Each structure stands twice: as structure tokens, then as C-alpha cells.
RNA sequence: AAGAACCUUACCUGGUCUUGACAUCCACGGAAGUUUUCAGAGAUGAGAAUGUGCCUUCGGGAACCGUGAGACAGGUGCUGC
RNA sequence: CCGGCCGGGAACUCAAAGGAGACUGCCAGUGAUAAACUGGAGGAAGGUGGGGAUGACGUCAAGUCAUCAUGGCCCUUACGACCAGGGCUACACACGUGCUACAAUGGCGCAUACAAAGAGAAGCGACCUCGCGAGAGCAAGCGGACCUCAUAAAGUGCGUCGUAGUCCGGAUUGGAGUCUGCAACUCGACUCCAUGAAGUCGGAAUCGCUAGUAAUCGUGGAUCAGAAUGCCACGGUGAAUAC
């Protein structure tokens, strides 16, 4: 699903784990209802944009691992709805038989 | 069904008037599966009917249902090619069920105030045969009597 | 001493205990009159106690959970018929011929894939 | 006491795993209630079967996660050491809890 | 196209899951991706070694891979040197330890992967698709099969229009879940295009 | 509308406005931040917001304050 | 039954009577009758004149009728003078709150037209 | 499409880059990194500090980084006839 | 102290595993001395019990080269690649599929009873305490038969409106906000306040549905930072009709 699109997703994952899985203090702790409400809260949202545009975990699309398909994803398997089926009825996802109730 | 002759489901009697005739009347009156609302209306109607008519409930409902009951109804059958109006003797199970539907169908219209009031008035007018339900049987007869030529 | 019958009409599962004594019917620490109000039929639980008379013979302590109104009321009807086993086959000859002891399995059909709800297909566009 | 809880995907791999862990405890140092079953988790998934269009056509899957308990009611010295370093049974997760 | 995967429908009943491990919802996804990384790698590396399937287990952070194969001597090599070379590189991408085991298969013509990989390999060497297909169908019935359906879809013979052609010899009851049917597919990348090769091998009734 | 914790402007647009206001009136500021709100100090400036394919000059008045910059730069053209 | 600009209802409960005022809804009306000290169940015919004058000063607190109509007309006319996206939306006769304008929009756009 | 504010995004506008964002090599220089400043819409370009490790053929290493060179990498471009 | 709270119990519901069971197996016609058909007992269930999965050879050179793989073909200072905006949400109009309606078997208030299924670690987030309310602070427990989202709603029971474009509808807009998020103007969701449109049952046509089904009420999940009237599941009440 375009090698560039898969390759730009590794920036988004690596660069997010660096900054905002650590520097959420800038948004969470500082922008809060307490004594820092004056210029300290203004300097937080000011300094939050100094960071790169990527890093925010909202900007990760979350696509299939094997192919890179953006749609049809499943968080349990980490796959597309096509590749989970290809892998399930084959013997790769443990315990995953056809349901019928 | 093409060749699948199977019988019908059994029904239940209504607690306060343990029977069958008016138990089905509740089902025809019902909308959206709300039997609690519908059954409260039929009791309310028959209690207001029994006060005015000066009879019981089963016999008050009977002397009312029989006055809107069809004897013969009109189907149309193409045996050979053409399309004409063939009257036929209605079956005893459908006979009273077809009457119940005409009482309720007339009660949808004729917007007095309450559903309990409207049924009570329709069944009261059915007793002295001058409602809309008796008119709907009267026309059904006229088709059968006029088109009696066809067997 | 103290006889028992289960009953479990439609998801709901009754638990009917029955003893020889008063005519009262206790249910989940509530009276039968106040627990089952105006809904459709209170006396579906008392239907099985007609061919075999109650009046002031058998007292009923019942417990039930699951389902709604008629699911529980019908589960009690089966629970009582199952519970009436103190005179084994003398009662069940007359009781079965009016239905009653038949479980009545019919549960809600699952939602089929593609269909909007069990049987309801969406619509049809033919151009 | 030690509440031992274990779960698996296969319903008939966990049975011998629960039988062996009870027997390597009951026989070696006494005491066991039994295999308490617990409710089975059924994580269903309803993926589209086709690669393009055909919303009506799907395949529905599930993964039965079968739980089991053991429950011993005395911290025995022979039993507590036999639980550790002596489990094995591949494809069967186990979590001892004091 | 409208037929269910014959392996997939029998996974609970007759056939076994190849990846046999439990995992909690957090790890499951990454544990399944690492499972694919070794399987993709180990299939491409051991090409001439003739591998049918790869069973993978994970008891308490220890990846026991199994390699079911027709030619076990080529997988091990001399003095189990290639097992140690596999054990190292597989253990890096997967997750810490490794325990590679090898299961021989004395009847290689009854395994669906090996028959399909044989036909595929033959198609790439300009062999006539019928002389590859029917020879595989005839060869495995003599040994001890009861079914052997074999489809070959694609261009085949350098044709303009594509055609699917199948030959079977015996009972191949696909709708029977009690029946053991080895099914597998493989892709023959010829000069004219891809040629798919499905194979069903009904061995036993239960 | 959103945001109680400080009306929002981009760092680059704030520092460009503060530098422009202290110096004096000059020319349209090429700015792409449509998202950014308008401050009282911006009144008088003719900043040019990016509509999509070009920059639209917007003379900021007393009223244009609580609103955002992209409101005065229609993107899609019709008839 | 003559409070504010208009309010002339009869045979109607007090809470629903005051909904007839522009600028007074259902919840606002209950705040009037709570502060005034009047039961919601009563109607204006049943009320006395001594109680109606207390309602007049109560609704005088809130902006109602032409005070409100002008406040709304000012705010809409303000937007159109700015020439903002909402203003362009208003004068063009098209829906404002980021709505779908392709299939529906009939309330703001009006009834159907020829092509 | 099992979910378009940005991302997704394949489209447009303008800015931009050509062994390239993603890969193994032939080899030149450096641990990797981390903190932090300036011009810019941002991509980017310019810095300033600190740190300077697992083996010694010690003209080298096994990774990582940034140069020049080509084998090339890349294409959600067309063809489901 | 009066709540499965308590020791305790291991009956029962439930939970799983391992199993019995239903086969025209049994009787009675009918059939042709057959298959079988009808009807009957026993039975929880009766003639494939209900439901699901399972889709023959092949058809439409059906769909997909944009999931992936893939032969050729074209592009390689651009048809490749990084970035800010914008756009995919445009709107004289036409259709498809829904939802909410047009009310009185109904609308709004107060008294309060009955589910099933699923979900959860940068998670789900109690009791609290602030708020008219979205929510906001402090934090309890739970990788769960325990802890939490979570009071199910139709349903009763009282009240009040009495057939009005209405106390029906709740569109559309103005203002004031809340959360998520680098960011909510293009272009989010929800909340409050005011606002109060079309609509009085729908032309020719026409669709689904044979019982826990249609109808109708809520409920959950997947994708998902946020963003369902869709999709996928779950249970409430529960009909009519089949000559
Ligand atoms: Mg690719
Ligand atoms: Mg996202
Ligand atoms: Mg049929
Ligand atoms: Mg079900
Ligand atoms: Mg659909
Ligand atoms: Mg269609
Ligand atoms: Mg049409
Ligand atoms: Mg047509
Ligand atoms: Mg096919
Ligand atoms: Mg299918
Ligand atoms: Mg133009
Ligand atoms: Mg008003
Ligand atoms: Mg309001
Ligand atoms: Mg919108
Ligand atoms: Mg962009
Ligand atoms: Mg360009
Ligand atoms: Mg083709
Ligand atoms: Mg085709
Ligand atoms: Mg096409
Ligand atoms: Mg062609
Ligand atoms: Mg005990
Ligand atoms: Mg016990
Ligand atoms: Mg005991
Ligand atoms: Mg027991
Ligand atoms: Mg027992
Ligand atoms: Mg079992
Ligand atoms: Mg037979
Ligand atoms: Mg016999
Ligand atoms: Mg016989
Ligand atoms: Mg005989
Ligand atoms: Mg005989
Ligand atoms: Mg005989
Ligand atoms: Mg005969
Ligand atoms: Mg005879
Ligand atoms: Mg005879
Ligand atoms: Mg005879
Ligand atoms: Mg007989
Ligand atoms: Mg039959
Ligand atoms: Mg059948
Ligand atoms: Mg069946
Ligand atoms: Mg079946
Ligand atoms: Mg069966
Ligand atoms: Mg075609
Ligand atoms: Mg492709
Ligand atoms: Mg295309
Ligand atoms: Mg080529
Ligand atoms: Mg070539
Ligand atoms: Mg292109
Ligand atoms: Mg679209
Ligand atoms: Mg729009
Ligand atoms: Mg939208
Ligand atoms: Mg509807
Ligand atoms: Mg409503
Ligand atoms: Mg209501
Ligand atoms: Mg209303
Ligand atoms: Mg209201
Ligand atoms: Mg709580
Ligand atoms: Mg709460
Ligand atoms: Mg306080
Ligand atoms: Mg409060
Ligand atoms: Mg909160
Ligand atoms: Mg709260
Ligand atoms: Mg759970
Ligand atoms: Mg709770
Ligand atoms: Mg919820
Ligand atoms: Mg719960
Ligand atoms: Mg009037
Ligand atoms: Mg009007
Ligand atoms: Mg009004
Ligand atoms: Mg009108
Ligand atoms: Mg009108
Ligand atoms: Mg209608
Ligand atoms: Mg007509
Ligand atoms: Mg509703
Ligand atoms: Mg819902
Ligand atoms: Mg969720
Ligand atoms: Mg819905």
C-alpha cells in the first residue's frame, strides 16, 4: 500500500514514542485548573506547537502490518480484514475457527 | 403454502373474562406488540358497553359481532381466461375474525376522543346496526347478491 | 415436605418450591398481586393450579431472574407443573393434554449477516 | 491458600493441563477443591470476506478463551514448590496468585 | 468463486491449528506478527529443503518452532550445522529463545503443499501442465491416497485466454467435516504470468 | 465553539504580529494559519489568509476578534 | 392575560401560557412561576389580577419580544456586514452549521425549484 | 470506508528534493544518542554544548549515523478482455 | 446492626466439561406383498425438532491490477518523494437507503418494578465534591462470574393537556458553553438557553415479512483521540394471516 506511506508511518510511530509518551506533562499537567492558570498555561500551548506536527498519537492512522491497508483494520490481530481471513483459515491465528450460533 | 397443510397455534384466555372470542379481538386491536395497552382498552370499552346496553360482556360483544358478520364474501377467479366476481361461503374461523377486523378498522376512523370510547360506540352502533362496520358488511353482501350469477 | 420444579421459558429461569399449607404465593419476597401487575396475565402462574385445585391446599415460595414479564410468568407456569410431582402420573395425564409441561423452546432468532434483523431484509431496487 | 487460575484456547488441551497441575499437588502434598470452570469468553469478529464491495457477504469468527480455577486451602511446602518450575503444557497460560 | 477453505472449516474438528499458543489481548497482535516474520523467512530460506508446514508454540517466552518436511537431511545439513544457523537468526526477529525441531515425512506425495510445490516447480521449467498434473495425480494414488483433486488455473502453455483445468481420481468429499483433507495452494511465476495450483488430498474418513 | 483554556494562535503568527505591530503598518502578512483566532492587537493589519490556491487580504476591524482567520477567506468558489 | 408585549391565552395552564411569549420557553416559564410563587397547574382564568402583576416584573428581567428580535436581527446583520463564512451563508440562503447541502437543506433553502 | 478537521489522502495549490522517506552493498568521516538556540508557513538550513560503549587483524570491528558513486529503490500510473 | 451481609451449605439457578436423548424407534390405518404417507401414544422435543455453518459442475470474457501477488506496458530532474493550506463535507436539481415525525394505543411531569449479550490497561473509571447540564477536579477497584461503562426502555401507577399545526413535530437559526485533540473557520460531537419550519398519513407505483417471525422498545460491540440515524450482535412486549 505504497512503500512511502508505510515508511512515513514508521516516523509517526518512532517520533511519537520519543516526545508525547513522556512530554504529555506540557499539555496535561500544566494546562490545568490551579495556580498555573495565568502565563504558565499560556506558555504551555505556546510551547506545544514548537514540537513537530507529528508526534501526536492521533496522527497515526493505524494500518495493517503485512500489507499497509489503512481501512479494514483490527486491533486484536494487527491486520487487514483480508489478511486475517487469509491467515485464519490456514492456521496462524490461534483458536480462530469459524463461528456459528 | 403450496402443499404444506399445517394447523394453527393455540391462543390464551383473557384473565378477567376467561374466554377466547374477545382474546383474539385484543390481538387484532393491538399495535406494535403492546398487549398491555390494548387489553386495557378492550376491558374499558366492554365495561362502558355493559353499563349502557344493560347486558354482560361476552353476550354484549356477541350481540354486536354477529350484526357485523359476513355470510358470503367476494373473491375473483380466472377459470378459462376472463376476470369476474365469484362469491363464496366464508369459513367459520375467518367469519368472526373478518368481522372483528371491520370493527377495529371502523374504530381507527371516527375520532371521538379515546380508543376505549370509540370501540364502545362502534359496538353500541353495531348492536342497533347503524355504524360503519355494518355498512362494510352490507356492501360485501350487495356484491355477492348482485354477482350471484357466478357460481 | 418440600417439592421442587425448575421451569425456564425464554432466557428467564424460575425456581418454584411448593409445600402443603396456605393458599398464598410468595415470589422474590413480594406478593403475587404486586409483583405481576397489569401487563397481560397474572393468572398464567395460577393456570396449572386449576385442573389440580389449589384454593387453600399448596403454598408456593418462588424465585425467578432473567427475561421480562411474560418470560418469567411462563417460566413459573412450567416451574409449577414440574413442581407438581407429589402425585406422580395421576396429575400429568390431565395436565399434559392442556399443554403446560411442554417447555416451549422458541428463543429469539439471532440477527443474520446482511439481513436487517433476523428475517427483515432491507428493501429492493430494480431500476 | 494460593488461588491458581489458568486459561487457554483449546477446550481439550486445558483439561489435561488442569488434571496434571491438580495431580502434581494433590498426590505430592495433599489438598485440592477441584477444577472450577468459570464462564468462557467468546470474542467474536465479523470481517468482510471479499476484497472489494459485497457488504452482504461476510465471515464470522470466534476465539473461545476457556478459563479454569484450582483453589487450594493450605500453603503446603511440597505443593507450593511443585507449582513453580514444574508446569509445562504449551498453549495454556497459567497465573498463580497468593 | 464460492468455496470455503477446506483447512479452515475443520480447524476445531479434525485439522489442528499450526500456531498453537495462548496470549492476552495486549501481546496477541505483536505475537502474531513475529509468528508471520519467521514463517515468511523460514519458507523462503528452506526452499529446496521441501517444507510442508511450520507449527509454532510459545510456552512462557520460548518459541518452539517445528518444521514438517520431506527431506530432513537437507534442513539439518552436516552435523546439525544448519539447525544452529537457523536457531540464531530465527531467535533474533521472533522473541529471545528458540527450539527448532524437525519432523520427517516418509510419504511426501500425500502432503498437499509438496504436491503443489512440485507442480509449481515443474511449470516453471516449461513442462506441459497436463504432464505435471496427471503425473502427480497418478503418483500419489499408487502410494495410499483415496482422493487427490488437483486444479491448475491461469495462462498455462502460454495461452492468450486463461483456463482452469482439474483432474481428480477418487473420493474428495469437501462438504464432509469428519473427513481429513489436506488442502494447499501455490503460485507458479512463469514468463506468461501466475499459474495457481490448488490440491486436495482425501486421506482418511475420520 | 471550542476551547476555554486560552484563545489559540500559532507561535509564528503571534511573533509575526507582535513584530509587525511594534514597528508599524506595512503590507499584507502571508499567513497560512486559518485556524488561528484574532487578537485586539491585530486590528489595523491587512493580513492575507490562504484560501487554498492564493492569499486573500483581510483588513481586520473591531468586530473581527472572537472569530477565526479562515472565516474571512472562502475556499470553494460557486457561480 | 396581557403581560409583556402580547400574551393573551385562556383555558391554558400558566406554564404553557407563558410559552406564547417570544423569548420564554418551557424551562424559563417554570423559573418565572417558581420565583413569582404560583402553581404551574393553575390557569390564567383561575388566577387573580394581584398575581398577574408579579409575572410582569418577572418577565421584565429576561430579554423578550422586540428586545430579543432586534438582538437576533443585530447579530445576523452583524455577520453579513463582516463578510465572514457565516455571513455569506446567511445572505445566500443556505445552511450555516456545517450541514449537508446537496440532498437536503430544504428548510433553509426553501421548497423545490425547476431546472 | 470496521468511522475524511490534520493525519488517513491516492486529488488540487504553492513551496521543495533527486541513489532519494523505505534496501543490501564498494568506501569516506564519525559511537549511538541527549539538551538547547536562531531564520522559515513548515519542509528545511545554520549551529552550540555534552556523551565518546560491548573486540583488538588494532591500515579494523557488529550496529547506528551522514557524504560521493552506481547496481537501482519507487509508482493507489494504465491493462480484472 | 437484619444487605447473601454472616458462619456455613454444595439442594436449586448458573457455570462448564463428560454424557444420555429422537431413530419413523414404537402402535394404527393406507400403500402394492416396497419405499413411503397419514393419524396415535410416550416424550423436554416428532418426523431434516428450532437456528446456524456448509454453496456441486459451471454461468455472467460479473467485481477487484486501489489489500496483496502478478505478465506485459508506460514513468524515472517525475506519473517518484517530504511539507503548509485547501479539497474529498461544494449545490438550480434527480434518485437510492435510513431516521424522526405527522400524535390521545399519544405528549410532558412525579411513585417506582423486570433483561440478555458484550467490553476494559497512554484501560474502563466508582464513591465523592463542584456544577442547570455537556462535564470538571481528587482518586476506589478491576487484565475481571468479583471492579467499572450500567438506572435497560417500552411496561405498570398517579397526575395534567381534550384534537389544536396543538403541552403534537423539533427542523432551522442566534447566543452561551463542554469534552477530545498541535488545531474544531471551512469541517466534529455533545450541552444549555432562546428559536419553533415542513408535516394532519402521502400520485402512478411499490417493498419486507409464514412465529418468539413482522411490528416495536431499549442494549452492546467492532473501526475509533474525537466523530453513527450505518454496520455487526443482544435481549424486552409480541400479534394478525395462511381458503
Ligand atoms: Mg508495493
Ligand atoms: Mg485516526
Ligand atoms: Mg413452504
Ligand atoms: Mg439468539
Ligand atoms: Mg446494507
Ligand atoms: Mg441493489
Ligand atoms: Mg422505485
Ligand atoms: Mg425497472
Ligand atoms: Mg474461482
Ligand atoms: Mg459463501
Ligand atoms: Mg470562478
Ligand atoms: Mg416561546
Ligand atoms: Mg429548548
Ligand atoms: Mg457534519
Ligand atoms: Mg496534507
Ligand atoms: Mg505541486
Ligand atoms: Mg484480467
Ligand atoms: Mg473479469
Ligand atoms: Mg471495471
Ligand atoms: Mg484485451
Ligand atoms: Mg464446605
Ligand atoms: Mg462439592
Ligand atoms: Mg458436605
Ligand atoms: Mg448434584
Ligand atoms: Mg439433581
Ligand atoms: Mg462439549
Ligand atoms: Mg427407515
Ligand atoms: Mg417395528
Ligand atoms: Mg410396526
Ligand atoms: Mg397395520
Ligand atoms: Mg394390525
Ligand atoms: Mg393390518
Ligand atoms: Mg385407499
Ligand atoms: Mg383399503
Ligand atoms: Mg380406509
Ligand atoms: Mg388392505
Ligand atoms: Mg389408535
Ligand atoms: Mg414429510
Ligand atoms: Mg424439518
Ligand atoms: Mg433443522
Ligand atoms: Mg440442520
Ligand atoms: Mg439433529
Ligand atoms: Mg468485464
Ligand atoms: Mg497493484
Ligand atoms: Mg483503477
Ligand atoms: Mg514487466
Ligand atoms: Mg520484459
Ligand atoms: Mg498518477
Ligand atoms: Mg465520500
Ligand atoms: Mg457542507
Ligand atoms: Mg457528515
Ligand atoms: Mg420507522
Ligand atoms: Mg420521540
Ligand atoms: Mg411519552
Ligand atoms: Mg414536544
Ligand atoms: Mg417537551
Ligand atoms: Mg458504581
Ligand atoms: Mg453514575
Ligand atoms: Mg463541598
Ligand atoms: Mg446537582
Ligand atoms: Mg468526567
Ligand atoms: Mg458526572
Ligand atoms: Mg468480561
Ligand atoms: Mg457497577
Ligand atoms: Mg455504554
Ligand atoms: Mg453486568
Ligand atoms: Mg374543536
Ligand atoms: Mg406556520
Ligand atoms: Mg405550541
Ligand atoms: Mg403547514
Ligand atoms: Mg398543511
Ligand atoms: Mg400508516
Ligand atoms: Mg390506484
Ligand atoms: Mg422511539
Ligand atoms: Mg444502538
Ligand atoms: Mg468501545
Ligand atoms: Mg439503531
PDB file of C-alpha atoms in Angstrom, chain B residues 57-113:
ATOM      1  CA  UNK B  57     -69.609  -8.548  28.300  1.00  0.00           C
ATOM      2  CA  UNK B  58     -69.440 -11.779  26.249  1.00  0.00           C
ATOM      3  CA  UNK B  59     -73.132 -11.565  25.275  1.00  0.00           C
ATOM      4  CA  UNK B  60     -72.869  -7.776  24.672  1.00  0.00           C
ATOM      5  CA  UNK B  61     -69.856  -8.381  22.395  1.00  0.00           C
ATOM      6  CA  UNK B  62     -71.743 -11.250  20.663  1.00  0.00           C
ATOM      7  CA  UNK B  63     -74.939  -9.227  20.010  1.00  0.00           C
ATOM      8  CA  UNK B  64     -72.781  -6.778  18.029  1.00  0.00           C
ATOM      9  CA  UNK B  65     -70.222  -9.047  16.342  1.00  0.00           C
ATOM     10  CA  UNK B  66     -72.974 -11.159  14.681  1.00  0.00           C
ATOM     11  CA  UNK B  67     -74.565  -7.940  13.318  1.00  0.00           C
ATOM     12  CA  UNK B  68     -71.245  -7.132  11.529  1.00  0.00           C
ATOM     13  CA  UNK B  69     -70.583 -10.760  10.486  1.00  0.00           C
ATOM     14  CA  UNK B  70     -70.288 -11.572   6.752  1.00  0.00           C
ATOM     15  CA  UNK B  71     -72.266 -14.537   5.380  1.00  0.00           C
ATOM     16  CA  UNK B  72     -70.712 -14.534   1.890  1.00  0.00           C
ATOM     17  CA  UNK B  73     -67.675 -12.603   0.570  1.00  0.00           C
ATOM     18  CA  UNK B  74     -66.442 -11.908  -2.967  1.00  0.00           C
ATOM     19  CA  UNK B  75     -63.247 -13.379  -4.454  1.00  0.00           C
ATOM     20  CA  UNK B  76     -62.372 -13.221  -8.196  1.00  0.00           C
ATOM     21  CA  UNK B  77     -61.205 -16.311 -10.126  1.00  0.00           C
ATOM     22  CA  UNK B  78     -59.896 -16.634 -13.727  1.00  0.00           C
ATOM     23  CA  UNK B  79     -61.075 -20.120 -14.820  1.00  0.00           C
ATOM     24  CA  UNK B  80     -60.675 -20.169 -18.635  1.00  0.00           C
ATOM     25  CA  UNK B  81     -59.361 -16.641 -19.239  1.00  0.00           C
ATOM     26  CA  UNK B  82     -61.585 -13.734 -18.125  1.00  0.00           C
ATOM     27  CA  UNK B  83     -61.850 -11.975 -14.712  1.00  0.00           C
ATOM     28  CA  UNK B  84     -65.278 -11.921 -12.981  1.00  0.00           C
ATOM     29  CA  UNK B  85     -66.596 -11.699  -9.406  1.00  0.00           C
ATOM     30  CA  UNK B  86     -67.233 -15.087  -7.746  1.00  0.00           C
ATOM     31  CA  UNK B  87     -68.916 -15.015  -4.301  1.00  0.00           C
ATOM     32  CA  UNK B  88     -68.058 -17.814  -1.858  1.00  0.00           C
ATOM     33  CA  UNK B  89     -69.285 -19.031   1.555  1.00  0.00           C
ATOM     34  CA  UNK B  90     -66.787 -17.747   4.135  1.00  0.00           C
ATOM     35  CA  UNK B  91     -65.263 -20.299   6.547  1.00  0.00           C
ATOM     36  CA  UNK B  92     -66.450 -20.221  10.219  1.00  0.00           C
ATOM     37  CA  UNK B  93     -62.931 -19.475  11.602  1.00  0.00           C
ATOM     38  CA  UNK B  94     -62.410 -16.496   9.246  1.00  0.00           C
ATOM     39  CA  UNK B  95     -66.106 -15.479   9.522  1.00  0.00           C
ATOM     40  CA  UNK B  96     -65.845 -13.935  13.005  1.00  0.00           C
ATOM     41  CA  UNK B  97     -62.210 -12.793  12.523  1.00  0.00           C
ATOM     42  CA  UNK B  98     -63.195 -10.818   9.396  1.00  0.00           C
ATOM     43  CA  UNK B  99     -65.930  -9.134  11.475  1.00  0.00           C
ATOM     44  CA  UNK B 100     -63.541  -8.218  14.326  1.00  0.00           C
ATOM     45  CA  UNK B 101     -61.171  -6.517  11.875  1.00  0.00           C
ATOM     46  CA  UNK B 102     -64.027  -4.401  10.442  1.00  0.00           C
ATOM     47  CA  UNK B 103     -65.000  -3.229  13.958  1.00  0.00           C
ATOM     48  CA  UNK B 104     -61.405  -2.145  14.676  1.00  0.00           C
ATOM     49  CA  UNK B 105     -60.894  -0.690  11.154  1.00  0.00           C
ATOM     50  CA  UNK B 106     -64.010   1.481  11.651  1.00  0.00           C
ATOM     51  CA  UNK B 107     -62.744   2.476  15.127  1.00  0.00           C
ATOM     52  CA  UNK B 108     -59.423   3.801  13.682  1.00  0.00           C
ATOM     53  CA  UNK B 109     -61.573   6.445  11.978  1.00  0.00           C
ATOM     54  CA  UNK B 110     -64.480   8.264  13.721  1.00  0.00           C
ATOM     55  CA  UNK B 111     -62.242  10.287  16.048  1.00  0.00           C
ATOM     56  CA  UNK B 112     -64.317  10.864  19.183  1.00  0.00           C
ATOM     57  CA  UNK B 113     -61.685  11.093  21.993  1.00  0.00           C
TER      58      UNK B 113
END
